[PDB]
Amino acid sequence: MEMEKEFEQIDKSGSWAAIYQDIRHEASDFPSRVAKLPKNKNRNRYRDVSPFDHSRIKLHQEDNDYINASLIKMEEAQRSYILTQGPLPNTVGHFWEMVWEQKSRGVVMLNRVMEKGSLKCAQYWPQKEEKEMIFEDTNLKLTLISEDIKSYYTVRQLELENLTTQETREILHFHYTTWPDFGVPESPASFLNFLFKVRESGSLSPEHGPVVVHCSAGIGRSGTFCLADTCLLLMDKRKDPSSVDIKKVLLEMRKFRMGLIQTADQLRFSYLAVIEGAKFIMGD
Numbered sequence: 001m002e003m004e005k006e007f008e009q010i011d012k013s014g015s016w017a018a019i020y021q022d023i024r025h026e027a028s029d030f031p032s033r034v035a036k037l038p039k040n041k042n043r044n045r046y047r048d049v050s051p052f053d054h055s056r057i058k059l060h061q062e063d064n065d066y067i068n069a070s071l072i073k074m075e076e077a078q079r080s081y082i083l084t085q086g087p088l089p090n091t092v093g094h095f096w097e098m099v100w101e102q103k104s105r106g107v108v109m110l111n112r113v114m115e116k117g118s119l120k121c122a123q124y125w126p127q128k129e130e131k132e133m134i135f136e137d138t139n140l141k142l143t144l145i146s147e148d149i150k151s152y153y154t155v156r157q158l159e160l161e162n163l164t165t166q167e168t169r170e171i172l173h174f175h176y177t178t179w180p181d182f183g184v185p186e187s188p189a190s191f192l193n194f195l196f197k198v199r200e201s202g203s204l205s206p207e208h209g210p211v212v213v214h215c216s217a218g219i220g221r222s223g224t225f226c227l228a229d230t231c232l233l234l235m236d237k238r239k240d241p242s243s244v245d246i247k248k249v250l251l252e253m254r255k256f257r258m259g260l261i262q263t264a265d266q267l268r269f270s271y272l273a274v275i276e277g278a279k280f281i282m283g284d
């Protein structure tokens with residue numbers, strides 16, 4: 001059923017809350033035993049958001065291999081994403097270790113450091129060229145190379161150095177800066193442009209490790225980003241673009257990380273983004 005017609009049917013009936021709860025009811029439930037170990041309590045921002053054991057990212061160290069991050073592997077679409085929480089003061093070094101070990105080219109950030117007058121994640125990147133950051137626990141160095149500030153997002157070029165081997169890599173930071181404190185954007189126009197800006201970069205492409213995507217918990221806005229990307233790519237390689245079932249794609253992604261899409265407004269916004277993004281893909 002063409003999703004644009006399904007959309008108008010849900011909107012006219014005002015059943016967004018009822019659709020959303022059906023997804024919550026059918027979603028996968030797998031063990032998260034490593035996340036709940038007492039040694040890992042200060043590695044978790046929220047007590048109710050944990051990565052499943054089967055899909056969690058492991059740090060390459062014998063001490064403690066735990067980070068709040070999950071590998072989402074989509075098969076027909078042939079895309080991988082790592083979805084993680086906003087780093088904590090004690091997990092900034094773990095975060096950059098993961099970016100290094102997984103060979104990621106891009107980091108996507110969908111939140112501000114402060115929202116609603118509270119801290120949503122640590123200041124984990126350098127703000128000035130001449131004041132670089134060193135993470136002593138993971139032996140990494142991070143330098144701001146350049147910054148391009150636009151109206152809806154900022155792109156930063158960073159240099160990450162493995163102080164152990166003296167190899168360096170260029171990491172692109174894509175920072176979406178205008179998601180509102182409450183609700184969802186009124187139009188998906190600025191959100192879709194941003195995805196194409198990550199796309200254009202090569203950060204989503206198979207010659208690199210998976211893109212690292214985060215918000216505060218790494219399920220809400222982060223969920224919206226990878227659901228829209230995957231839906232639009234399937235609409236491209238399939239004879240009938242109308243086959244694409246946004247809900248069934250979202251249940252496949254919830255097999256890898258719990259809670260993706262946190263509200264009925266985020267679910268509606270995901271529909272709008274895919275519907276709009278498809279008009280300039282089906283050849284416009």
Ligand SMILES: N#Cc1ccc(Oc2ccccn2)cc1
Pocket residue numbers: 074075076077078230234243244245248249252
């Ligand atoms: N990559 C990918 C992917 C494609 C399809 C998926 O689920 C369905 C199932 C039946 C009809 C439509 N979509 C889930 C993931």
